[PDB]
Amino acid sequence: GHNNTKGNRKFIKGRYTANAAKGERLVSSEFLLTFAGHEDISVLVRTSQIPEMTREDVEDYGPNGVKFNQHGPIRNSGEIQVQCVETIEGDILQFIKDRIAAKDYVDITMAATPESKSSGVNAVTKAATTIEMLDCKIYSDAIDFSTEDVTAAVRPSLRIVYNWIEW
Amino acid sequence: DNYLHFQHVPSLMNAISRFFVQLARQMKHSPDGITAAGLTKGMTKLLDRFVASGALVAPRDPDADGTEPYVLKVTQAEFDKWEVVWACCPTGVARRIQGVPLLI
Amino acid sequence: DNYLHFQHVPSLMNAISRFFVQLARQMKHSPDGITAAGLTKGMTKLLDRFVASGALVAPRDPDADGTEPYVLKVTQAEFDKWEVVWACCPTGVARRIQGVPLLI
Amino acid sequence: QYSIQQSLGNASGVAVSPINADATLSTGVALNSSLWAGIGVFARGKPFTVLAVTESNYEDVLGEPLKPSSGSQFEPIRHVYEAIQQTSGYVVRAVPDDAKFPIIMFDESGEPAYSALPYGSEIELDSGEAFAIYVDDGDPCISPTRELTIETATADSAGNERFLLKLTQTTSLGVVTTLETHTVSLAEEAKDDMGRLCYLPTALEARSKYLRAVVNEELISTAKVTNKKSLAFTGGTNGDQSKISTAAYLRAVKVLNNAPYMYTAVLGLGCYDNAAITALGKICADRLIDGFFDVKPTLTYAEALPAVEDTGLLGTDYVSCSVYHYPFSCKDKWTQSRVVFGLSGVAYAAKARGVKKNSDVGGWHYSPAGEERAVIARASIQPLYPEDTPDEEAMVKGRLNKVSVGTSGQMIIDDALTCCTQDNYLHFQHVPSLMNAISRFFVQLARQMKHSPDGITAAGLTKGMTKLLDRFVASGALVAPRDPDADGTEPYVLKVTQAEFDKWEVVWACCPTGVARRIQGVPLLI
């Protein structure tokens, strides 16, 4: 039917070895948040993010219809969505109440801690996969309670706005 | 000079000893009673909890000493004498700080 | 006959030293794993504020030293000891000015 | 606010030392990608033993850099500093014969007696003397004075007596600092507060890096120690280190040869002795390792070429050995004094930078020369012999590498040639490097292949070799032949041939990657 068909499994083996040459793929379940002086909450985090890391773009239409996009100033501030689990002693509620009561800025460190790169009972982090945010503000959201949800646990949603990204 | 004149160092060991006493009192009501195998599992659980709380930390020099915070070992001489020992590496405190200004 | 003639250079050094002493006194008597990061972050922020205020400038000898107005280093010495060292470059002052008239 | 102290004692407080008008702050980092080796002369260190130095230890281990005014004693530390900014390594120290270390002997009453002995000699205790304490570190106490203080302490729980031994350091000006403290007991069976032993030799061997002790077994029992003030070591000196005979250099080379640490480069750290250079080259060729060496920098362009032939490296035996010449002058980092030294540890830095590119097998095909990998970072460069021009073709025929100014403006190593006269594609640096890396990988594979139920077998070798060569092809070291009609498209050919039954042969051929060093442009006009 098709006269162009030809098999070549040496090429496929080459692609397989080239792909496998690099080490591993980071599973999305391996990370850690520090929250500066409140290090007891690091266990309860369940979702995190990496900041946008973009720039503004400037558009200029040249002679005729020629258009060029150019780099702009760095984007500093943004938002990050974080979800936490809630205990029967109100750790997250007390944390949010304390944050609202006194205007504070908290530094947050985001890092990846794979099982392969660890010594003893302590995780070890790498400079390449570590990012930092400074002067952050922690805000809460509406928390849903309902019956007939016997199989679910309450999970507050937190909204964090950073003001500088450093590495 | 035994690292004991610092307040917390005796406090950790006293708390662990009290927890061990409470565990051993309850274990005596078990059908077998006090047993060397039984005394290791509970101690491992409590020492792991104390490591989780942050009271025990890894040794400062990983080359000289192992990375584990605590070492629990059981030794037997003859059959009548048994021995259960655990060692711990307590957390340090920060009390003396020095700054050294310079000029370019 | 050093850079220590002028009243302002020791003033800058003593102001930075007093700020460091206050910062260290804030974070006293704390367990392990906390003091190093707090010390280095606070000290970097303070020296950045002094750089912004105009007190520190780039060094006058770029061959011997880089372009950085300040450097920092924090280490832990013993069970209950810390050591922090820093260097910085002061700002000059205009004292003596000379003029020379000429005739066409 | 309140009072501020200058130095810390035992109380809880924050202290600020007085402002220092002159000092330098340095920050380091550790990495172990590739391990180097070499030989040099330094201030202090245990002689004729392998020492492991990192970026944060090369000042404590080794010593303060020697002043250039002394002459010819400062190059090795500069080479070590230049090379160590990439990765750590190993160093063996060579010392002249007229070198001694101090030692203090103690009488039964407790009075001290000072003396000194050569490094080779072993201490013998005279009758009437109980114990002696000496300095294990090869550090003469000439400029920094070291004092010993003895005072009594509380007796042991069992009743044994013990005393405090403290070490102090005093500079020439008079500033006194504290180095070490110990609680040691003369009794054989004594225990510390923390439970450790306090026998003087055992305690000093265990938890001290400066001092050791030797005791007389017969008379140790009836010995008494009384409180003594500071006692200074005397008689410890280093001979003229600018005159080192070839025997010491050869001994250091032999010490390097018998080391199991499995380093991946050998460097000549300012060693301008021909016999030592040939021995280092023999070590380099023995272990299937690269090697970088230096000719004397003060030599002119005309005299440099015979100097390469003076060393025995020019031949077919020592492949993958490079010789560099650098007659320029620069300001020294520690003291701005316009010193001159060669290029050893700068080339190795370029090789390490190239190796760091690939993480699977290393990527040894990158040549050390180049504008991006090889850059000389020195303060101000001034030629020693201006208005002079080298003969580049003679240098190429002589297997001598050249330096040039880069596009950015800094000096650049512009060529990379090995000491191989034959035209075998082997004078290019990376070609021997690829095959040496493959050979080392094969050796490690074959060592693990045995200890298996069947041991070494022809079928087993082919599979591992195919995996290894596929990985090397993936890293980009091996490329397809240039002419597809004459030669097959495969980059490597692995085959097993049979002759009789007891002869087996495993051979693999490879097509190495090319380098780009000669470019020509031809302008035309329409």
Added chain:
Amino acid sequence: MFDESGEPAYSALPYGSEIELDSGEAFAIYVDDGDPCISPTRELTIETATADSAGNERFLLKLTQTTSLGVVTTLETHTVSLAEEAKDDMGRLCYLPTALEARSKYLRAVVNEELISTAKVTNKKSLAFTGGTNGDQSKISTAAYLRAVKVLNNAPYMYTAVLGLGCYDNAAITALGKICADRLIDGFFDVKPTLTYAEALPAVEDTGLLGT
């Protein structure tokens, strides 16, 4: 040239020659600016100072310039020592050759290693250089031009043009043309302006640049 106890002596040497210190002399200081001191005179004054931390002796070296009418102007000051391991207040080294080579624009010094172990300096005022002369500059051999062209060829700097600057010497002109053809840059050369119209044409061929 000074000696032990600081007794100055005056001399002059040709530019090419190097300085040799006769026995019984400690050190010498000479002008490196290549400027004869004929019309504006230059003087040296020496003033002792306090010893440093290590106890090594130090002094001050001051340079001044005087015009014909008597106006005195200040040029430079330094803190100098005669010991190798001597350090300034700021932490720099005070050895005379190194200090003068590193932080000075006019003066350079040469030291005799035999006698500096026991040398002394006293307070002197207004020691003026003498003997510095510029020769007859209307008669310069072609060797000097060729040497300076060779110096220009190996200059580490980058330039995009070569100027004759009134040489009117055929060998120098053709050497400059070789430089232009080597670096691939432009060259602007000139012939003698006092020639007439008829004589100008052969001189161009005499320059040797005609061809391809």
